[PDB]
Amino acid sequence: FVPFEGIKNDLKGRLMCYKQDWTGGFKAGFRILAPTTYIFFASAIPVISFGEQLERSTDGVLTAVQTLASTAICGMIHSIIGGQPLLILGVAEPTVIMYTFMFNFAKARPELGRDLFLAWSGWVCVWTALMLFVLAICGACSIINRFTRVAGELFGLLIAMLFMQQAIKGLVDEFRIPERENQKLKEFLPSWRFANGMFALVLSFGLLLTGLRSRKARSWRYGTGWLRSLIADYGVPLMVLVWTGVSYIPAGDVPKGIPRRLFGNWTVVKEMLDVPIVYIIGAFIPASMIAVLYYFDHSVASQLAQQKEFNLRKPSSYHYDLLLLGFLTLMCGLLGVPPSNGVIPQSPMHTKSLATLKYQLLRNRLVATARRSIKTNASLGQLYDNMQEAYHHMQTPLVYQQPQGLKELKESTIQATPVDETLFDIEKEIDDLLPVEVKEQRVSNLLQSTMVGGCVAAMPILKMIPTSVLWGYFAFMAIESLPGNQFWERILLL
Amino acid sequence: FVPFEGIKNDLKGRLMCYKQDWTGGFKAGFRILAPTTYIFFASAIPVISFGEQLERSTDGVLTAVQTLASTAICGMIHSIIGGQPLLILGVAEPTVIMYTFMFNFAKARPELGRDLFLAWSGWVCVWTALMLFVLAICGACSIINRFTRVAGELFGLLIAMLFMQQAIKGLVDEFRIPERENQKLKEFLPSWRFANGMFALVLSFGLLLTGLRSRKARSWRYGTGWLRSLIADYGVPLMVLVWTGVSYIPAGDVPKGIPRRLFGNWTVVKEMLDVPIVYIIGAFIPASMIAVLYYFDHSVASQLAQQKEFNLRKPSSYHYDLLLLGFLTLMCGLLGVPPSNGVIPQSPMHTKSLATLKYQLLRNRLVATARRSIKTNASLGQLYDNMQEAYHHMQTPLVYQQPQGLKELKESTIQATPVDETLFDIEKEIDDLLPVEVKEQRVSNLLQSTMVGGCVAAMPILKMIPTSVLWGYFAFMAIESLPGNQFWERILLL
């Protein structure tokens, strides 16, 4: 717990893999788009829903534009000067709840009111940034190492429950009347309300089930490997588009608002000084709560994305990441947008997507080299050396760790068996000698954040997405937040 | 093709396993209820739907009561004096189509009209019975042996397509207005029609998916074996009841007819003679068509239930079955109910259910005897002999064939391994040395037919079932009609 020690160590560790990170990201060509698109959707949809929630709860002060902008800019800044690019930054539900409480508080104060809510929020963000700077400098993140696996598994289960609760609330609300829209409308009649609710159920459950099924496309006996990979990679986005189109089928015999549809930044410094100095000091309380919440969430999200099973070859940057989070919180507060922070399951999903990308690249290369070696000599022991050489050749030269390497050939495999092609199927065997590795780089995070920012200008296209699709995705991510963790497995076995 | 040869041979073969059939059925206690209940539902639901269709298409002359009664009585008669009890008898879609055509024809004839439609149908049935008697006596069923596997696979695919088409038509009609009900009603408004359609979609798809998932309960890692078996056995009926109850949840905020709900015999001999003799002769044409259709359907259904992969130990009764079908057609025509005939996939489903029952009984006995032997000596070769002895002891003593017997212990199994319990798991190994056998008896068919007959008196309970559940079951049976047949597999691989 020495001042500036952890930050300096993290910077030293991460400064010798920066060019390597960018060059590795550029090494893979357009194949990096699949994880990028997957995480882009996973980050945009919850953020858009949170923006709509804030707009309904803040009388239009904060909308999806502000949340999307915060997520975007903070994501780009982290991707460029972050330290742990595997982390995905975005506006989380606890931030929305806290901002709702602050807005409700300020609305009842004649001193603050509604026109000064953003300024008071900015002062709260300044206090939170100071607290985060103090925590990072003093090495308070060292306690994160103390927290064991269950400390993160419980948080993941809690986030899954929160996402499922949000989805269920949305589905139920599809049956009810909004508190802002015109009450005397054709689309809001009890019969049409029931129809909207059941249609929302159909769309949401269809999206959820089809996406879950498509996630297992690679393990299908039918179609070609190209199509199977395309489905396994872009199924959930494709399902989103497909069910959005399905929602338009009965448009010729139904009122306008059936099913219900969805729908830069500025500075608040000038009006920040107009706040009387009895609430600038009072911001220490909500700032304290938000600082504690962010200290916990950022670190837990970063560590859940750096699981030992992934065999990462680069160090961690907890302290420097917290310092940059303080800086980003200050910037967001000054810009009049809610702060962003490390979110789950977005970060572990990003890590798993990168691991799958590297796995597929390695599988393709090894299958190619095995096929090339089968024709020439194919000695079953000289071919294996060729695949090992190719594996080492693909690898990025670093200084911290070394490649895991192809694992030992199983005794049963050699016993079953130059090499006879009839008795040696490459596709069946390669999967048995492929380690778990992650393609670590900064390109995927940068593109994902830029795409989220681009959604600000694509609002007309986003107007065509029904809310039922959002609730189906929320449940999909909730199930993704318990993808087989040890705690969930033990509860299941109990 | 000698007169009365095939009938006599079939009777000779089947007359020496009658008491054995009944005693084998009574050997299994209440465990025979699961296949009985499964096939009872599979036979009752399509028959009820066909009855509603006929009622709508025959101006109330024929309802679900007549179809249920025909199915019941014919099923009991076949189960007692049939010859091939694996066959399931019921009113099929081709019979409904033919009867619809005959009713439409008669409605336009002033000589016949509507009050004499049943009498003309009875004369048609008399002609069909005579044709079936002639076909059976002359040994025309010998050509059935000529027809190969594809001849039955194509028929199964056609029946699957017909069932799926019926389900899709029902789902679409849930969105439209019936042509008999009052047009000026609250439940038939366009908004309420749309709500009913989407609710029907939800219920049907929920039933279909939940039943398909529950069909694989035995291969689950969770719960106890008792619960897993109960689910795998009674899932589809339980799902029917569960979704029927779910349909009642919104009853407190929806009109009466949302979702749409579903709702002995006599003699027509006296009015049969009132038909002028220009149509009694004219019945030869529809009688000829129905006779050809029945000759094909009965034989194909019987042979699809006697696949070689099932290793049946009893002979076939094609000719005698056709003769009894002629008798039953005559009886049904005289009773004023549509004739019954062998139906698919009900018969193959019955055979598979009986095979699963025997498999589970054998697995339980072998697991018990292996556990008992493990404590005493457990020599891995003396225990196997004990399991073989138990298998032979359970077996029914017949004269035609012999038990297949436990297959050879795999070389890998013995190589992997008194016997160490840690390295020899019974549950994992038993499945590897269990042959495919069918529990052939007449009790299951008799109980299923009696239950179908009992549904006549349980009409009030059947009034609570929505039509969407029927369409979900129709799709479930359609998928059951292509359960992995070779033709469907080849088309899939193409």
Author numbering:
A (entry chain A), B (entry chain B): 5 to 267, 278 to 431, 440 to 516
What do the paper's sentences say?
Boron, essential for plant growth, necessitates precise regulation due to its potential toxicity. This regulation is achieved by borate transporters (BORs), which are homologous to the SLC4 family. The Arabidopsis thaliana Bor1 (AtBor1) transporter from clade I undergoes slow regulation through degradation and translational suppression, but its potential for fast regulation via direct activity modulation was unclear.
We defined this mutant as AtBor1active and identified three distinct active conformations from 3D reconstructions following cryo-EM. The densities for TM13 and TM14 are disordered, so the atomic model was built to residue 516 from a dimer structure at 2.77 Å resolution and a protomer structure at 2.55 Å resolution with robust side chain densities (right). However, a structure in an occluded conformation has not previously been reported for this family. Interestingly, residues 369–373 and 457–460, which form short β-sheets (β1 and β2) between TM10 and TM11 in our IF and IAI structures, switch their fold to an α-helix and loop, respectively, in the occluded conformation.
